[PDB]
Amino acid sequence: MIQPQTYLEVADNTGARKIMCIRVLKGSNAKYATVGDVIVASVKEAIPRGAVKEGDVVKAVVVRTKKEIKRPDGSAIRFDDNAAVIINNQLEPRGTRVFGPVARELREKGFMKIVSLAPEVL
Template sequence: GDVVVAAVKSATPQGAVKKSEVVRAVVVRCAKEWRREDGSHIRFDDNAAVILDADGKNPRGTRIFGPVARELREKGFMKIVSLAPEVL
């Protein structure tokens, strides 16, 4: 659920974002295990982020692949949660 500033490492040829572009993104999956408020631990298989638009709340894309963390709902990223196929 952290918002980070990142550089695009790879992009599709006709995509909206270009390689080496500096963007704001929210982390939706983290491979490093972390503890939730209820005491449980959660860990994903990979690291993933969703690129955000200029206001920093809505995603620039219209599709999200794979599960996202439940903490996004608490931080107000409802559009990302609604697009995700699964919320863990």
């Protein structure tokens, strides 16, 4: 589960590699997150030459979780990591090079921009 204290590496370029979770965006009490969850964040790890410096306070939505996901169809899956996709103050993935699998669940939520370039929808 995603408490506001967790590291969340990135499954994309953007100019980042790892972060830390700040809050979520659900109810002012929804202190827990999973797949496709709208999460605020402070990067704490960003590689030298990109468009988002290390530390910088920005937002994101999460996919690829250490916490298994149980669909409405009895099936399930857990990702070996806590990755995500980063966004701005206008909801859109900043970078472009998406790495690894993603949940098609998110696709019906409505973040198709990742899904389009997604190399492994799962």
